Amino acid sequence: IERVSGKPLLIGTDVSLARLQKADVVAQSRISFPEKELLLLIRNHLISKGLGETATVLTKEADLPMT
Amino acid sequence: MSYNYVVTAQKPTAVNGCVTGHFTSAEDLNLLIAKNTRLEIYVVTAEGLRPVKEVGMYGKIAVMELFRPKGESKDLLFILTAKYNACILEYKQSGESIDIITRAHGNVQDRIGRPSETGIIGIIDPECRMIGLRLYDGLFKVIPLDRDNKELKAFNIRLEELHVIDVKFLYGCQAPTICFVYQDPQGRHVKTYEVSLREKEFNKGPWKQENVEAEASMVIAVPEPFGGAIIIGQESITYHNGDKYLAIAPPIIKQSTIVCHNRVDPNGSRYLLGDMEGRLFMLLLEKEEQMDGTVTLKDLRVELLGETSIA
Amino acid sequence: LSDRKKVTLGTQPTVLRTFRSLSTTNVFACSDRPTVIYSSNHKLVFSNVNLKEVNYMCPLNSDGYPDSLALANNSTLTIGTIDEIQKLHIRTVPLYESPRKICYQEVSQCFGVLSSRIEVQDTSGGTTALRPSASTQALSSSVSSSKLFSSSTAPHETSFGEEVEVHNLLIIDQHTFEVLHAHQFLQNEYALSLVSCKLGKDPNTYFIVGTAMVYPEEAEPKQGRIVVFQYSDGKLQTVAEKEVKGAVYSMVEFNGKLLASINSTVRLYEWTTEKELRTECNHYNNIMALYLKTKGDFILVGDLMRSVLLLAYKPMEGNFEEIARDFNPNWMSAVEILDDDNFLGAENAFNLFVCQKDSAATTDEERQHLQEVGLFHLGEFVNVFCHGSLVMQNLPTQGSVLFGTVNGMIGLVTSLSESWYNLLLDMQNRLNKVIKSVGKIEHSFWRSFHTERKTEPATGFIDGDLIESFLDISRPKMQEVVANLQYDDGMKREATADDLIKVVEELTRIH
Amino acid sequence: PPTLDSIITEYLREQHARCKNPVATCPPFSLFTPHQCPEPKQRRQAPINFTSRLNRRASFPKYGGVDGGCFDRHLIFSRFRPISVFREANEDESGFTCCAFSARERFLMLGTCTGQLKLYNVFSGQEEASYNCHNSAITHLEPSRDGSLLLTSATWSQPLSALWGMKSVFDMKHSFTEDHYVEFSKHSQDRVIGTKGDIAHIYDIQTGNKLLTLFNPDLANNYKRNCATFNPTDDLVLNDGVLWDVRSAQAIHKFDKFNMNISGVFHPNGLEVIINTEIWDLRTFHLLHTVPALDQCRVVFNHTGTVMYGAMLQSPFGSSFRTFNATDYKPIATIDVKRNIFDLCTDTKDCYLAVIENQGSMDALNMDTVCRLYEVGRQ
């Protein structure tokens, strides 16, 4: 099944063949993302876990849309 | 036996294909609207539009595109009927004598096969080297343009890809090259190719682009400074140039299907878009000078421009 | 000076004047046939006016008419101005939604236009529109009652507002053209068929709409009803309905009886005094019957895929009877009876042909077979056919059929005389050696009947649009058209240039 | 070691694998919204309903737009109705084998077990004129299109085919003794090709000579039922499932063997070769498709080549019908005949089905073969 399809490196998963060339595209895609969506996730984690005395410090490095 | 009489009371009014250029004069832009069989030669004034000569023909005009070959100060017009008889038109004026010269013609068709599904599609090479025609669903009929052709010769290079949705041409890259939107059995992609007219054979393509959006309807090729191929879909818009890629998904284009386009600026900086419901959009390209000679793309803007008729 | 040219206007002495309507130096012919001389698509072809007889004109100065002129005649004095001059003046009454059909009321002074509006489904509300067309902006609104498709649990839920269609009946005013009434139908109920006539011994003049119930992700429908309306004192009334197992495609009036076409079953009706309908007869030998045209007591049925089907109606028996049937499978587009012997049919392949009813009734096999007589490639899709001409009645050719298209190209179909057919067809072959059409396209090749399987050359009809360009031909090239040809004036004469130009003008006065 | 530039990289990718038809050059993401790749949403397609294909075609071209052509044929070749029953009331039992239609479709040319073809009016229901043609039986029976010739083949009779004349004079114009099965040529009808066993012979009708005998034992699939056929451009021959150049008398390419019986037919678009259930190419010889309902059936087309028929040759004979599409091979309908089907022929003008069916059960001692007509597209 590996030979007549897109050659996975002997990983045993999703042995159907229509589900094997789905795994050709989803794996080799080029995912990129903006950094701004992640920096708000950092600040939303610090305030919730007790140590929120650097949320005001993060005004300097980048923007602060929410308080 | 029954003998009856048929004339035209009202000349046809609905339009089909609109090509601008320099058909009448060298430094005068004009408009060439075909409607059913008529070919209405307008000209553009600063106040608006003005006709010159209305010419009808024996066949439904469905594909038309001007082109200036190397060797002509003015241009030529190519028109294919619905009955597969082609013609190359040339305007001749001598004072008030206003004439249309057909330079070369010839009915090119085949004995066998399904005609098509999405009508007839025809696009001219920008270097004026070949003439595209999708005619019999598996053949890709190419017209070798020359002054050797007092009548039209024809090639039929086989498409191994059968069900083609769109086809276009890409701009100046030393070789006349093609773009598809082909429906595979398993997925759908955008393949390219390269035709050797001296060898009648597809060459090895520069792009592969093995999977694209599921509803890719049209291909908008951008010109020689930053050449590539925009792939409009139902829901999103990409860009491709073989190495890089850009993609957006603007919330404007969410309730209508893109149907029409045009190259507004001669360096391809802006593009207008219509829909199935009357809207007009604008594609703004953020031209980025990376180096002292490098031209590349930075951003894709879609601006709502208002409501008109169904374009 | 150049050559003279005799053009007939009437029996009294004429007057030719020029003036200023508003600008552009408008020119008028004050004659027994009052014509505008100035322009017709920037060309010297006369265009009439809407006045009977004009003797003089007078450039007056009216306070409510800018730069208008009065017309001293054998009748009253008309201070009026003249608009953009052309052959066919076109006045637009916009409604901003898809029209479907048109009927006419004589007794009521109103039209009827079936409509089509795009709407999306709201999550909370029922539906919602997209832009303010003239459907919601009506003088009176109503909705259908007696929801009689309630027993069928077919209307299941949809997720989003994915562009359902809503139809209603628009009764348009006679002269103000204001939308008088709107009657919104049930959900996903199309409006497919509309006429306006009288049924039985009831002197009321009705609107009759035969509808169908539609769903996507579905085959051909088996539901629907037929609704008959009236316009009592400007108010629309639903009198009676008849729930019919099938989609209704075409309806024509038949001698006081209602003819319909319900899924390959020609189903003629009958009006009773109990305000109902009774199926008088039926028919079942059809693929899918979409077209119905009547003239007297013949009924011409246009099939889906096969052909022209002529069906008789014997009033003594009370039931239909198959006289004949064509067998060659052409996909019909629209059909029309000419003269109850010749039957005009269109096609999806953008073509025309007439089947003639067979004369030599030597046996029973050869009298049930129609014969395709004449072929033509009308290079245009055909939607409509109707009677009636566009010229004034001066009380030549016989009859007139106009046809509706998809590119806005209205033409005329009429009948000739067989002596003139030999006169006209030979002139087509003379002009097909002189006229160099653009493309170097043979007109015998272009008008040839070309389907995917028949490349049979055309015969029968006359392409008069090739004829009427003879006026544009110069006389050093008109002289070569006139070879040793014939002329009928039982008689026999060699053709001449000044008479062949008359025969074209005998056809140009129609159009 | 991993960072957030590997976890958030992999957090979206397994979220990306729930995209029905995913993408490759994806748009930029949004972590506070779900991710769903653009689904196929059709707007340029004609709808599944037919009356909504009728409103749309009024303001659009021919069919209703893109994908409006087959949606007519999925409503109009899925129903049939019997027209009339044709017996052989001479020995009070019917013994026909083969059937076809005439060049103008007025008479249907049956063929008995005795050796005579019997004409019948399609309108009347009365014998016109029988013809003592062969001795053994009748297997194959076709006219031409111009209305001049007739090919009738026998089972074991010492001349096997009989090139008749149907103009005015009934005589075997030429005679073949060798070949089991012949056929006309499609485009130019100057060729009648003949094949016994596995060897194909190209003949003429003017002279009757072996024009080009082609056979290569080096490249023969060697089936059970070979039938030499021309492409509709009249340039290729299928001898034993091999393409054959008629120009320079050489073989082209052999196909693989799968069910031991059927050699291969052409499809009327001139693009394919239909081996029994393998659907090939003509310029690169690849496989397009493989249908499990094409197990050992003989194909019957429309004259334009837009619908395909199927009859089983299993032992039973043709338990039901089989109606295929000639573009993408999606099957339309299999309506059922309770008896066993033997021969199946349709019109050039596409209105009837000559059905030779088997009355009674599986009995070699009693075969009652009536003839029945079906109307194309009527409930």
UniProtKB/Swiss-Prot annotation, chain A:
Stated induction or repression of this protein's expression: Up-regulated in a number of cancer cell lines (at protein level).
Modified residues (Phosphoserine): S16
Signal peptide annotation: none
Domain LisH: 34-66
Compartments (UniProt record): Cytoplasm; Nucleus; Cytoplasm, Cytoskeleton, Microtubule organizing center, Centrosome
Coiled-coil blocks: none
Tissue specificity comment: Ubiquitously expressed.
Lineage: superkingdom: Eukaryota
Function as written in the Swiss-Prot or TrEMBL entry: Acts both as a substrate recognition component of E3 ubiquitin-protein ligase complexes and as an atypical serine/threonine-protein kinase, playing key roles in various processes such as cell cycle, telomerase regulation and histone modification. Probable substrate-specific adapter of a DCX (DDB1-CUL4-X-box) E3 ubiquitin-protein ligase complex, named CUL4A-RBX1-DDB1-DCAF1/VPRBP complex, which mediates ubiquitination and proteasome-dependent degradation of proteins such as NF2. (Microbial infection) In case of infection by HIV-1 virus, it is recruited by HIV-1 Vpr in order to hijack the CUL4A-RBX1-DDB1-DCAF1/VPRBP function leading to arrest the cell cycle in G2 phase, and also to protect the viral protein from proteasomal degradation by another E3 ubiquitin ligase. The HIV-1 Vpr protein hijacks the CUL4A-RBX1-DDB1-DCAF1/VPRBP complex to promote ubiquitination and degradation of proteins such as TERT and ZIP/ZGPAT.
Record text about domains: The protein kinase-like region mediates the threonine-protein kinase activity.
Subunit structure: Component of the DCX (DDB1-CUL4-X-box) E3 ubiquitin-protein ligase complex, named CUL4A-RBX1-DDB1-DCAF1/VPRBP complex. Interacts with DDB1; the interaction is direct. Also forms a ternary complex with DDA1 and DDB1. Interacts with NF2 (via FERM domain). Component of the EDVP complex, a E3 ligase complex containing DYRK2, EDD/UBR5, DDB1 and DCAF1. Interacts with DYRK2; the interaction is direct. Interacts with RAG1; the interaction is direct. Interacts with LLGL1 and LLGL2. Interacts with histone H3. (Microbial infection) Interacts with HIV-1 virus Vpr protein; the interaction is direct.
Family the entry assigns: Belongs to the VPRBP/DCAF1 family.
Protein name: DDB1- and CUL4-associated factor 1
Source species: Homo sapiens (Human)
Encoding gene (name): DCAF1
Range within the parent protein: 813 to 879 of 1507
Swiss-Prot record, chain C:
Modified residues (N6-acetyllysine): K440
Mod. after translation: Phosphorylated by ABL1. Ubiquitinated by CUL4A. Subsequently degraded by ubiquitin-dependent proteolysis.
WD repeat beta-propeller C: annotated span: 87-416
Residue numbers carrying Phosphothreonine: T496
TM region(s), chain numbering: none
Cross-link (Glycyl lysine isopeptide (Lys-Gly) (interchain with G-Cter in SUMO2)): K492
Protein location: Cytoplasm; Nucleus
Effect after changing W331A: Impairs interaction with AMBRA1, ERCC8, DCAF5 and DCAF11
Region (Interaction with CDT1 and CUL4A): 149-511
Annotated family: Belongs to the DDB1 family.
Disease per UniProt entry: White-Kernohan syndrome: An autosomal dominant disorder characterized by global developmental delay, variably impaired intellectual development, hypotonia, and characteristic facial features. Some patients may have genitourinary and skeletal abnormalities.
Quaternary structure and interacting proteins, as annotated: Component of the UV-DDB complex which includes DDB1 and DDB2; the heterodimer dimerizes to give rise to a heterotetramer when bound to damaged DNA. The UV-DDB complex interacts with monoubiquitinated histone H2A and binds to XPC via the DDB2 subunit. Component of numerous DCX (DDB1-CUL4-X-box) E3 ubiquitin-protein ligase complexes which consist of a core of DDB1, CUL4A or CUL4B and RBX1. DDB1 may recruit specific substrate targeting subunits to the DCX complex. (Microbial infection) Interacts with Simian virus 5 protein V.
Domain notes: The core of the protein consists of three WD40 beta-propeller domains.
Role: Protein, which is both involved in DNA repair and protein ubiquitination, as part of the UV-DDB complex and DCX (DDB1-CUL4-X-box) complexes, respectively. Core component of the UV-DDB complex (UV-damaged DNA-binding protein complex), a complex that recognizes UV-induced DNA damage and recruit proteins of the nucleotide excision repair pathway (the NER pathway) to initiate DNA repair. The UV-DDB complex preferentially binds to cyclobutane pyrimidine dimers (CPD), 6-4 photoproducts (6-4 PP), apurinic sites and short mismatches.
Name this polypeptide is given: DNA damage-binding protein 1
Residues of the full protein shown: 623 to 1140 of 1140
